[PDB]
Structures are given as structure tokens and as C-alpha cells.
Design a protein around this nucleic acid. Structure first.
Lengths: 109, 83, 100, 98, 100, 83, 109, 99
DNA sequence: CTAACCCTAACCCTAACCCTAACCCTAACCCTAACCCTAACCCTAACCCTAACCCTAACCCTAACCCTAACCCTAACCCTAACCCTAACCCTAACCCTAACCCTAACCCTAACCCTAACCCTAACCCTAACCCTAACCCTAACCC
DNA sequence: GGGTTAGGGTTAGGGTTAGGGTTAGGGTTAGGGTTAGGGTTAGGGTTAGGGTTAGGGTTAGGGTTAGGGTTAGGGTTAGGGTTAGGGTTAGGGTTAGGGTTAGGGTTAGGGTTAGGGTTAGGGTTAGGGTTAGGGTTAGGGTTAG
């Protein structure tokens, strides 16, 4: 009996582990009972955010003429995107740096 | 273990480099002592929280996870070392 | 005799443009390790530390110092002045926090 | 020796797949992967905490979808919240149909 | 008769103590309730507010405005000036981290 | 209502008394518009949060508990206007 | 026989409901299992904090020549003592006013 | 009148009996009562959340007096922390001596 | 306004290590049978917001006078910036040892359901004393002379 | 220059709305059972941190000389402070209405749990590829005429 097992992710169309997201919510003591659409919803949100961040990082890396995504590109993309900067304001990325910006008064007279 | 020389370790040239990145042209002579003082005040609290976490963990080795958990309580979150 | 002596400000702007591009550390590691080992002696004795711990400590300290220096530079420029003074850090370890 | 180490888990296998769809030829580093893992874990715990607080405020005992949607609308800023809500509704509809 | 007429600053310093000694609200409730209604009209229609939500909003807004005015006065005194200018509020919001 | 004089409801005196309570002796004539704009934005944020909470609660009335929970999210807790 | 019932608060000589603190910690979904000394510890801490705050409020009321404790006295006490303002810095108390403080620069000649 | 009603739980009587001990011949108002209730609830939530996080970080599933003391030391500032720790240890010792 | 001169941006090799593939396998995600606690749904009753009509009242809006602080130009010198020469101190490998973190068993010991009363906490009622508003009576502050 | 003005405590004194004491009742905590699971002790192993030696190479301190920045001073002029006089607007009543929400009384869709059974990501090697290092080199900058 039984059937070829189909992973819950495949049934929905996502790329994040819905089973792992559900297990983390179960072993997190956030509530007594857990639903069935919440892990898929959170996995889709995480996948969208990761896709946007990786798109910005790849754009920054291509602008820097490199094939490796270093944390410098991540920091640049996060500090350039207004919504991502508002979402991650208290976050400090290691080996990132700051944006090159000099005040107009400090410029040569 | 020298008190004065361990703080005097952050030399005057180093403090200049940290201000050039922020965007400072001219620096006074009474900035380095206050910078060292603020650094000590921050490090005291961070190390206090880290040692408290280590003692609660019943261990004698401070870890990067404990450092991150101590930094996250104060507000700032660090991505990279540990996690 | 002309030793290509630059006017005060050009070398400072050059160093600013240099250090606003690199991502390396600007603080020595051995005296910082000495300091973080000496400070921990007041809370308990015979503790041993790891490398990643002091690395994260130095990273966070450098980030906080860069932010504080940016705030101090803004406060100094607001006062119609170019140089930074100890009077600006206090109005900063205050409007924000950490107790001047 | 003989291994004998707690098997640790992460999202490194899932992040790599997403990178390949968005940009086909680029590559990522271990430090960037670890930073992305921490970011994902932080967003996960934020969403979970907000959903738990909403469930405890509404005197409920289960975290269903509407709760995650409200948590997203409260946490995410502007159009990112709308896009995430749209994608989550699409995923939930596909999972319900299939 | 024509009064001695008060020198500039006396009335202000007298009202400062009076307004710092009291606890009552300084904003009228009726013009603030209609503003709250107009602001809530954008998100959803047919909304019904109670008698405590508007009061809590007014209290929080007055506290925030008092704090912002204190920060603005500090920034103005730092600038070797007495009166407050719109640049002081902008600098306070920039240092706080709300505007940018 | 929907009148365009809604923001103008905060009068020039009101701001004067607020600044006197804050501790200002001399006030300029361009502080009022900035204060009104900041007040309107601060009200819009909290009202957005409260309306979101009310819609999530599936009701048409805005209670004080929703406003308290919205203010606790921004970091400024309010004590006493609600449990 | 069931015998007489000594309330748990009485055995520890406190004034806070230890039985209610345990029920709250159970229903709060903070953990799976709850100990026995944790509610007593938390009740003792809360009682100490409340006693200190009420002592400061009573001192403020005595200084104000009144018999009731108004929120003005609470605000004054919290803004005055060293370790109370640091604990409740982000806390805004309604009907509490501000602390009288005028800068020396704005003072007359 | 209708199908029953709703009873609400508040820490008033306790704050009043603590006030009678810390300062006899003194009254209090409902505003200060609600403020003290909100303060107690906030401290309760903070100490519960910190204890839960401390228990979850060490792969443990039981909140005990040690975790509560650690949370108090991490939350409270200086002298108040030690005073609360001592007053909690005294109560725990009394309870262990007589349950 | 060029000379003279300096510090960067920009190619052509090398090579090293960190990234990208291919294996083995073990812990973990699915199906398929139970089951019951939780949530949805309709009816109803009390209430608490929502409108409108009143008055007068402290309140706000507009004008005039005029003392004042913000703003701009100028001069002095003292604090700070650029450059060279030491030599003391930071940086990198290898070796060595040992204390401390993590696996691996066995076991009490402390924690979790579950009837059962019963004393403690909450909702109403009645009361009265502490607080608030109304008028004389100084009472001390401004600020010219 | 010691007054005129002139806003702020000070005190009887009466009125009143809100804490304080008292009962009746539902309800929630503690007591005496059984049961099973997480927390503690006692071992072994293995691995990462601290203590030593060895250079030798980048760089900070200590000067020297100088030129751009700060503070004080003075003058000028709008832009706020202060005060009077009139009139729309805010605020406490009172009345009526009706939309709303917090319960009960069922009921079926959705929750958890366990036991096999298969599989996908985590723990190992290996190899080829990307960028850092080290020389030239044109060009844009900078100091000073």
C-alpha cells in the first residue's frame, strides 16, 4: 500500500523546508496547537525576502565585477535599499563597512 | 595586567583611523581619553553580561554564542561571527 | 626647495577616501585582547576566552565607535565648526543614550 | 573520535538553490551564508513571537494563517508586506488545491 | 496708569514654572478627536473610537512633544543661542534615529 | 470629519504651552509646522497599528488595549490608561 | 483526614499570591515544566519592588503635605532615585507631568 | 440579568496590604493602583520571558529558582538586584524549611 | 598659466587555497489507522457610542509698540597638520602540555493528572472624611529713581 | 538710591465626590493518591587554549615648521515679546436612538498520536578555478610658480 511520497514543499511549490519550519514552531512553545498554513506562509515570506536580498547582492557583485558574493555587497545592498535599511536598522554585518559619504562642508574649498 | 597600559593600548594613531572612516577632518587633543573611557564603559557591560551567561551555563569558557546573546540584549544584533 | 607639501586637508580627505572603502580592522589585536582579559578579571577569576568571542567584541566596538564619531562629526558641523570637540560627544552620549 | 558530533542543521542547501534561480552564474561565500542563516532565523523568531503574542491576546490556542498574515503586516514595512502577503496567499491556495 | 511693562523674558520664565508644576493637559480634546477621526478615515471607514483611546493618544503625543522640545532646547543651547530653530528639531530627529 | 483645517486645529498657543513645559524661553515662527507634521506622522503610525489590531480582532470599535499594545511595539509603554 | 490548609504564601511569609503566580507561569506557555521555588522568588522580587516604590511614594506624599498617593508622587519618585529611572526609562506615566528643571543659561542676569 | 458575566483579576489587595506595612496611615488612588498593577504585570512578563529564554538556550525544559535568579541579575540594575536575590533566597529557604 | 612631481586606476603572469562536485547513511518526514478538544454559527439582551439643541464662558485672533538677540566683518595667535628617523613592539610557526568540553551509562527524585471540599477573592452597598473652590490678608519680587 | 505695582502663598470655611469598611456568593487553590520522565553522578576520551622560544619588518613617538581656524569685539536691523479689545468656538448639560458585543446551545471539521517505511541532507574526500601578489604604465591630482 502507501504511495510515492510527495514532500509538502513540492505540493505547494516552495523551496524552504515546510516540515522543518513546522517542527521549529512545535518545539518553540509559542502556542498549544499549530495550524497547517502558517509554516507554508512563513516559508514563502522567507523565500521572497531571501530572493530579494540575493538579487540585490548579485547586482552589487556584478557592479563590483566579481563572481563571489562577499558581505561587503550585502552591506551595500542593505544600506542602499530604503525598506531593507528600515527593516534592518539595529543590525551590524561583520566585515561589512560603511557607505562612502563625505559632507559638503568638509569638501575642498 | 597593567591597568593604565592596557587602556593605553588603543594608541592615538588607531583612534584617528576610526574617525577618518566616519568622516572627520580635524580632531582635537581631548578626544582620545573620552573615547577610551566610553570604550571601557561599553566593554564592562558587555563582559559583565557575557560572564553572567557563562556562569549560568556552568562553564569556564566564554563563547561567541554567549557574546552574541549578551550583545542582543542591549539592542544591537550582529550577523556573522556565530549565530 | 619644493617638497610637494600638501595643504592641510588634502591628506585628511585622502585618508578618508581610503578608509571608507576597505573593510579591514583599524585596531590592533594583541592590546585589545589584553584589555578584554584585564576587564574580565573584576567579574570572576581564571576564565578562558575563544578567538571568535574577542573578534565579535572588536567588531562591535569598532562599529559603535564609528557610529559615535559620525554623530560627533554631525554635532560639530551643526555648530558651524569643522573640528570635533569633547563637548559634542557628551550631547551625543545623551540625545541618544549610554550616559555621558 | 569516530564522528560522535551532534549533527547540526542550517538553511545553506536552501539558500544555494534560491541563488541559482535569481542569478544563474553567481556564487556565495561561507560568511555570507552564515549571515543569511542568522537573518532567516531572526525573521523566523520575530514572526513566531508576534504570532504567539497575537494568539495570546486574542485568547486563542492555535496559530493559524490569519495570525501570520497580521504578524507580517505589523512587522514588514511597506510594499514588502503586501508582496509577502500575496505570495503567502498564493502558496496557501496552491497547497489547499493540491 | 501705563504699567511699568515687563522686560522680555520675565513672563516666559514665570509661565515655565507654572506649566512645569501642573499636570493638566495643554491640548484641547475636541479639535484632537476630529484630527484622530480624519487620520483613521484613511485606513478603514465606519470606525468607532471609545473614550480612553483618544485620551491615551493625546497623553502619548504630549509626552513625545515635550521630549522633542526638550531635545530641541538642548540643541539650541548647544549652538550658543537661546531661541529654537527648525534645524534643531531636524538635528534631534537625525541623532535619535527617526528621520534617517 | 474631512475638513482641510484638521491639522490647523492644533493652535499656536497649544504649541507655546507645550514648549514652555519642555523648557523653551524664545520660540521662532517656523517650529509650528514642523511640530504639526511630526505630530501627524506619529498619530498616523499609531492609528495604523491600532486599526490593524482592530481588523485582526474582527471588530469595529477601537479599545484602549489596542492603543496600549500598539504603543508597546514602538518601545514607549503607557502605564495606567489601561491594564 | 484532609486536615487544615496552610496557604503557600503563608508558609513563605510573603504578601503576593504564590498560587496565582504559579498558575500564570503555567498558562503563559513559557515552558513545559515549572519548578516550585520560582513563583516564590518572583513574588518576593515583586514585593520588594512594590515596597520600595510605595515607600518612595509615601515620602513624596509627606513632602507634598498630602495623605493620598497621586501619580505625580510616583513620577517624582521614579525620576528621582538612582536605580528606578534607569529601570523604567522608556515608561511614560499618565498624569505625571515633568520634573522641574531650568537651564542656567536661560536664567536672568 | 443575562447569562452570568465576567470576573476580572487584579493585584490590588496585595499592593494595599504592602502599603499598609511600608507606610501606615496612608491612602492611594485608583490611578496609582492601575499604574502599580501595570508595573507588576510588566516586570512579571519581563522576568518570565528572560527565564524562558535562559531555559531554552541550555536545552532545558524546566524554569527553576536558579534561572529566575539569573534573569533577575540580568534585568535589575545593581543594588536592587542583590537585594531581590537575597530576599528571594530567604523565602526559598523558609519554604524548604517549612512547606 | 605649464613644470615638476606624486598618487592612483589599469593590464600580463603565477599559484594557492577555498569553493564546487561525488559518495555513504542515518536521523527524520510521510501515510494510514484511531480519537476528542476546539472553533464556527444562530439568537438574544443590555449598553454605550452616535447625533442634535442649548447656553454662556474663559479662550483665541489681530493689531501696535519697541527692547533685544541673531547675523556679519575684522583681527590675533594658539592649536593643530605635514614630514623624517629611529627602535621598540606587533606579527607568524612550531612545540609542548594540560585542563575542560562532550559522549556514555544508571538511577533515584521531582514533577504531572485527578476528585474533593472550602476558604479566599470579587461584586454590590453605605458611609464620611479628605480634598477642592471662594473670598480677605499679607507677602515678597521687579525695576526703575 | 526705597518706593509703587503686582503676581503668588496663606487661611478659614463651606461643600462634595471618591476611598474605606461590610456581606453574600461562586470559584479556584491545596490535600492525598499513582505514575513516569527529565535531571544528577560517575566515568573516559580528545581536543582546543595557554605558555614558551625564534626573528625581522611595519609603524608610532618625538620632534620641527608653518598656515588655516577660533574666539572676542563691534555695529546693525529685523523679529520676536508684551498688551488690549472684540468675537467665534470649546464645554457641560439633556434627550432619543440603534448598532454593537458578550454571552449561551449545538455540531461537524480540524487538531494530536503512534508505528513502520523510505529518503534527503549532513559528514567525508578530491580537483580545478578565482583572486591576491608583484611588476609597468598611462592618467588625473597637487604644489608652486
Amino acid at each position: 500500500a502507501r504511495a510515492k511520497a510527495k514532500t509538502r514543499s513540492s505540493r505547494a511549490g516552495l523551496q524552504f523546508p515546510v516540515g522543518r519550519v513546522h517542527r521549529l514552531l512545535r518545539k518553540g512553545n509559542y502556542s498549544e496547537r499549530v495550524g497547517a498554513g502558517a509554516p507554508v506562509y512563513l516559508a514563502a515570506v522567507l523565500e521572497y525576502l531571501t530572493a530579494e536580498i540575493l538579487e540585490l547582492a548579485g547586482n552589487a557583485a556584478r557592479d563590483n565585477k566579481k563572481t563571489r558574493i562577499i558581505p561587503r555587497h550585502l552591506q551595500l545592498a542593505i544600506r542602499n535599499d530604503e525598506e531593507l535599511n528600515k527593516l534592518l536598522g539595529r543590525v551590524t554585518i561583520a566585515q561589512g563597512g560603511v557607505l562612502p559619504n563625505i559632507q559638503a562642508v568638509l569638501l575642498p574649498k | 595586567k597593567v591597568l593604565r597600559d592596557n587602556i593605553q593600548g588603543i594608541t592615538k594613531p588607531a583612534i584617528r583611523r576610526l574617525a577618518r572612516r566616519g568622516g572627520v577632518k580635524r580632531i582635537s587633543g581631548l578626544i582620545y581619553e573620552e573615547t577610551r573611557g566610553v570604550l571601557k564603559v561599553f566593554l564592562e557591560n558587555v563582559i559583565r553580561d557575557a560572564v553572567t551567561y557563562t556562569e549560568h551555563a556552568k562553564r569556564k569558557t566564554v563563547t561567541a554564542m554567549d557574546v552574541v546573546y549578551a550583545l542582543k540584549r542591549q539592542g544591537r544584533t550582529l550577523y556573522g561571527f556565530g549565530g | 626647495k619644493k617638497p610637494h607639501r600638501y595643504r592641510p586637508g588634502t591628506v585628511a580627505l585622502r585618508e578618508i577616501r581610503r578608509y571608507q572603502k576597505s573593510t579591514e580592522l583599524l585596531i590592533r589585536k594583541l592590546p585589545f585582547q589584553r584589555l578584554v582579559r584585564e576587564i574580565a578579571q573584576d567579574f570572576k577569576t581564571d576564565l578562558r576566552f575563544q578567538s571568535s568571542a574577542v573578534m565579535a567584541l572588536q567588531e562591535a566596538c569598532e562599529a559603535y565607535l564609528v557610529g559615535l564619531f559620525e554623530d560627533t562629526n554631525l554635532c560639530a558641523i551643526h555648530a558651524k565648526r569643522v573640528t570635533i570637540m569633547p563637548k559634542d560627544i557628551q550631547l551625543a552620549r545623551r540625545i541618544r543614550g549610554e550616559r555621558a | 573520535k569516530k564522528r560522535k558530533r551532534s549533527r547540526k542543521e542550517s538553511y545553506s542547501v536552501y539558500v544555494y538553490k534560491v541563488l541559482k534561480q535569481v542569478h544563474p552564474d553567481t556564487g556565495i561565500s561561507s560568511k555570507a551564508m552564515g549571515i543569511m542563516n542568522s537573518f532567516v532565523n531572526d525573521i523566523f523568531e520575530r514572526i513566531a513571537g508576534e504570532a504567539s503574542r497575537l494568539a495570546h491576546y486574542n485568547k486563542r490556542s492555535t496559530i493559524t494563517s490569519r495570525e501570520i498574515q497580521t504578524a507580517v503586516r505589523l512587522l514588514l514595512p511597506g510594499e514588502l508586506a503586501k508582496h509577502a502577503v500575496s505570495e503567502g496567499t498564493k502558496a496557501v491556495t496552491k497547497y489547499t488545491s493540491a
